[PDB]
Every structure is written in structure tokens, then in C-alpha cells.
Curated annotation (Swiss-Prot), chains A, B:
Residues 1-306 form the Peptidase C30 domain. This is 3C-like proteinase nsp5. Cleaves the C-terminus of replicase polyprotein at 11 sites. Recognizes substrates containing the core sequence [ILMVF]-Q-|-[SGACN]. Cleaves and inactivates human TRMT1, preventing tRNA guanine(26)-dimethylation of tRNAs. May cleave human NLRP1 in lung epithelial cells, thereby activating the NLRP1 inflammasome pathway. May cleave human GSDMD, triggering alternative GSDME-mediated epithelial cell death upon activation of the NLRP1 inflammasome, which may enhance the release interleukins 1B, 6, 16 and 18. Also able to bind an ADP-ribose-1''-phosphate (ADRP). The active site is at 41 (for 3cl-pro activity), 145 (nucleophile). There is a cross-link at residues 5, 90 (Glycyl lysine isopeptide (Lys-Gly) (interchain with G-Cter in ubiquitin)).
């Protein structure tokens, strides 16, 4: 019973978080085997960030300028390099708490957990999604850069996000663990604006299935629709177009509940056109789009990790 | 920037979770030093739960009937006793991952993190509150009993909740770690209904302060009010009466923002009487009441743990 925004257990990632200080900046790094990964803007002053030439700034840095601390103990840096927008600091000790892991570049609409950290110490954990405009709506303050996002599968941590920037609109931008930004964003203090923050239709529908599983049923109607008919309504409300691939992904939830996907689309259609009339669904007064189909099955299933 | 429902890092608690099986029931236990704590209904069959006599059922149990597993290794049970609604299983090995900890019985309105587990393995983490009717709105399936709720302060885990029951209405009931239920609930499969699920007024006001800190300002008005005037409106909307003690707790957020608490009460009053007119606050279309004042300061502050 019940449905909550649920993050993955964070312990496997907590054991990888370190502090990285270069000259005057301190942020977080990720220690996996004998490499510490962090944002390359650790090498910049606040002034540098208006027009940084990272290769030039890096030339004035040596291994011993990167002060890396795992809890109370210092790590010895024996090499460094820049890969896209991250630095890889080779250290002389493999992290003994390195979990089984992979680096993944996620697609928009996918969800992940964030372990917010400051000065190398974990502060909290919450659940995000990669938005269709390639921002995330996180909770990050100064000093949180280098905090990571991840998913877990059985005993493997798939790292998908590293936090680098806050846009002037208060949303967040960052990279995969190869250091390539999601979307068009850059690690410069400049005018970069987010595009339309469209709604992840397949996730809304998954959440509606979660609601039915839990007794919230008032929005089910006698109607059905078609993909093309539904998508005229999605367009008007700045929803992603629903594809047959989405329908196929919702197959398991459809079979579990006996509600055809297109029937659920017709319920969503009525919700978009008429609103919720002051009612709630799973404790929400709006249509939630940061649960994936897999998220719903998992929470409705009890899937565990190690 | 940003405000999220944020749980504590779960690693310190993950290291304490074990599996407890008695005869035919398997749920979760909490391993701290050389004691494993779990719900006493691990000793019951599904049939027993309609009218269990726990002392009588316990007489037919010995140490070796309690099969306790921490990951893949078996723990040896060398004594057992019942304390209120929990069992304490003495084992012959102190948990090497025992964090610094305390047991606390929380008051309604306080928040905590839940580490949902199945078969001794962590599944996810989320943020709850103790409701004024002494339920919690969690996400628990069969097998999650024994999962715990906790807060962290510096390096100390304060355990406050153990999960025992699901009410027929889909909300959740449980105990502190001394085994005393929150509220009037019992570990019997019977008619126990929840009282009024009132709203935690001081938490709504804290969240409104969080919203102002973050740029969400449209609900600020030119009005003020008094405690007694505001509370006539709280009563009508099934809000907790606001006390001077609540006002004093909101002092830090008031000082940070320069908005007098009673001015914020007048904004909340207008929100209760007029609604949100289809607008949102911090991504929500309703008035959120599961952030405490301390929660807001913490997330708006960057407070870290170890
Ligand atoms: O350097 C910035 N902040 C200060 C800082 O923590 N460091 C700067 C030195 C390098 C690493 C650490 N840049 C920034 C922040 C928020 C923004 N919101 N809109 S533009 C924008 C730019
Ligand atoms: O025993 C129940 N469930 C089955 C079970 O997991 N075990 C029973 C044996 C002892 C431990 C494990 N009781 C219950 C559940 C949900 C309810 N919702 N409303 S009443 C109500 C009663
Ligand atoms: Cl909402």
C-alpha cells in the first residue's frame, strides 16, 4: 500500500564520495578504484567562470595542487587528466568500498537518485528525472558540484549524472561520468536558457497505473482513444508525443491491471482537458511525471538490491 | 536552488538490516551491537494475527527457531525476549557496522526517513512524517515489516520507527524501537480506523518560507493576522492550531527572510480560503506539510553528516 517518491539506498555511493580542493575551490568527487572524478571547474576562480579556457588554466596545475580527502584521510594524487568537462585524478590507493559499477548516459525521461553532498560528506538523497529539455529539477546549493546521480540494478551502481551548474532560472545542468553535458549546456557563467519543460507522458501514464493499483480510481472513465487522437491533446498541453514504443513499455502495467493503455490515455486526456476538480491522485494535486514504468513495477513489486 | 523531498543518506542503516525468519514468516530486523530488533508478529501465522496471544505463542519458540541472516551469513541467536511489541534477539556477534545511535520516540508532526526493506535487503529510501492521528503515509508491501525510520544528527542515527502494520485504509502503523505503538494501534488484524488526518500547520508555514527563499513569491500578500484569528481558519480546514511555541520555532526562518510569521500566516489563510487558482508552489499543487522548520533550514543550509 502507498506510493512514495523513492530513491535508491545510497550506501554504495556514500562510500565513494570525497572532497576535492584546488587552490581556492572545494567541491565533491567520486572515488572509483584508483580514479577520482570531479567537475573540471574545480580549477577555476569565480572570476574564471565567465570565460574559462580550461586547457590554459590546467597548465598551471600539477598533481599536488589537487587536495583530495576521503573523510579524514588524505589521498595521494599521482596523475591527472581532463576528459570533456570532468577531471580524472589518479590516486595511489584504490577505493576499498568501490561497488560493482557502470557509467551510463541516460535518455530524457529516465529517473535516477541524487546523493547531495557538501565538502565530500553526504547530506541527503532524493529522486530526479532527466527532463526533456535536458535540465534536472534538483536541490543543490553552493558546494554541491560533483554530487552524482545513479541507479542500482541487483548489485551494480550505474552512474549517470554529475552536478556542475545552476542556471539563472534555478534548474540544474550537468554531465555524464564521461564529462559530456546533458543537452546544450556548458560550464561557463553565461546566458544559457532552458527550452520548454515538457511533460513525460509515458511516466504520467505509469503513475496512473500505480494509482489504480493503490485504490485511487476516480479518474477512470468509460472512454478510449487512439495514439493520434491522444497526441493532439498532448501537443496542446506540452506533453511528449506518445509512441508505440511507449505503449509497449506500458504492457506489463496494462496486463497487471487489465486496463488497456489507450483506455488509460483517454483517462489522462480527460484529466488534461478538465483538470482534477480539486481532487488528488496518490497524494498529489497535479499529474506526476518522474516515475518511470520500471519505477512503478519496482515499488509495486518489492525489488531489492544486495 | 530547488527544494526536494529529501531523505537522509541510508548507508549507516543499510549496514544494520538483517532477515528474520520464524517458522513460516520472514521479515526484517535491525542489528545494533549484539541485539537484533524485529516485530513480535514474526512468530505468528497469518491465522494467528486475528487474535494472537503473544506470550502463549512465544512459549513454543526457542533461540534456534529464530533464523537470522545478515546478507549471506547466518547469525547465532543466544537469547530472546519480548519488550512490548518487539522482540530482542541476542546474537553472539556484535554488528561491526553498528553506527553511533539512539532510540527516540518522536512526536506527531516530526519527519523521518524510511529505509524500505524486503528479506533483509534495502529496496529504497523516502521521507515520511508522523501524522497527527499517529499513522504514517508510507510505501510498504508484504514483507517490509521491520523496516525502520530514522533521523541523523552529525554521526548519530536516531531510530524512531519500526514498521508493523498496514491498516485497511492503506496507511501504516508501527512502533518506536522500545516496541510501543504510535497512537492507539495494535498488532492484531482487526477493525482499527484512523482518526482525522489533520494538516501540520507549522510545517506548511516552514515550506512557505522555503518557497520564498527559492523565488516562489506569488502567494505573499499585503495582510497580517493574529494567532486566534488564524486558528479559526485552521479549525475549519482541519489544520492543527498554531501555538506560540510554533511561532518561536519559525523564528529563524522569519529572521532569514524578513517575513513576520503572522504575515506568513495571513498568506496561508488566503491560500486556504481561495485555493491556489491553478498555480504551484515548489512544484506542488497543494500545501505540503511534511517538511519541518529544521528540515527547511537543513536543505537551505547544506548541513552534512559524517
Ligand atoms: O562559479 C559559479 N558559482 C560559485 C562557485 O561555487 N564556484 C566558482 C569557482 C569554480 C567552482 C566553484 N558560477 C555560477 C553559479 C550559479 C549560477 N546561476 N546562474 S549562472 C551561474 C554561475
Ligand atoms: O498478517 C497479516 N498479513 C500477512 C503477513 O505478512 N504476515 C502474517 C504472519 C505474521 C507476519 C507476516 N495481517 C494484515 C495485513 C494487512 C492488513 N490490512 N488491513 S488489516 C491487515 C492485516
Ligand atoms: Cl501536489
Amino acid at each position: 500500500s502507498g506510493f512514495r517518491k523513492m530513491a535508491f539506498p545510497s550506501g554504495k555511493v556514500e562510500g565513494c564520495m570525497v572532497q576535492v580542493t584546488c587552490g581556492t575551490t572545494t567541491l565533491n568527487g567520486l572515488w572509483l578504484d584508483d580514479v577520482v572524478y570531479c567537475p573540471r571547474h574545480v580549477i577555476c576562480t569565480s572570476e574564471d567562470m565567465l570565460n574559462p579556457n580550461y586547457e590554459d588554466l590546467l597548465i598551471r596545475k600539477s598533481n599536488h595542487n589537487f587536495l583530495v580527502q576521503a573523510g579524514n584521510v588524505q589521498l595521494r594524487v599521482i596523475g591527472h587528466s581532463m576528459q570533456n568537462c570532468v577531471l580524472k585524478l589518479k590516486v595511489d590507493t584504490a577505493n576499498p568500498k568501490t561497488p560493482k559499477y557502470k557509467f551510463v548516459r541516460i535518455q530524457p525521461g529516465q529517473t535516477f537518485s541524487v546523493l547531495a553532498c557538501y565538502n565530500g560528506s553526504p547530506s541527503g538523497v532524493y529522486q530526479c528525472a532527466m527532463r526533456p529539455n535536458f535540465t534536472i529539477k534538483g536541490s543543490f546549493l553552493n558546494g554541491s558540484c560533483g554530487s552524482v546521480g545513479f541507479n542500482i540494478d541487483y548489485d551494480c551502481v550505474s552512474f549517470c549524472y554529475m552536478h556542475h551548474m545552476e542556471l539563472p532560472t534555478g534548474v540544474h545542468a550537468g554531465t555524464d561520468l564521461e564529462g559530456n553535458f546533458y543537452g546544450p549546456f556548458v560550464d561557463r557563467q553565461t546566458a544559457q536558457a532552458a527550452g520548454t519543460d515538457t511533460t513525460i507522458t509515458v511516466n504520467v501514464l505509469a503513475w496512473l497505473y500505480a494509482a489504480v493499483i493503490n485504490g485511487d480510481r476516480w479518474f477512470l472513465n468509460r472512454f478510449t482513444t487512439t495514439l493520434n487522437d491522444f497526441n493532439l491533446v498532448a501537443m496542446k498541453y506540452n506533453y511528449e508525443p506518445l509512441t508505440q514504443d511507449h505503449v509497449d513499455i506500458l504492457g506489463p502495467l496494462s496486463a497487471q491491471t487489465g486496463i488497456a493503455v489507450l483506455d488509460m490515455c483517454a483517462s489522462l486526456k480527460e484529466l488534461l482537458q478538465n483538470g482534477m476538480n480539486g481532487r488528488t491522485i496518490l497524494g498529489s494535486a497535479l499529474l506526476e511525471d518522474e516515475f518511470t514504468p520500471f519505477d512503478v513495477v519496482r515499488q509495486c513489486s518489492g525489488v531489492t538490491f544486495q
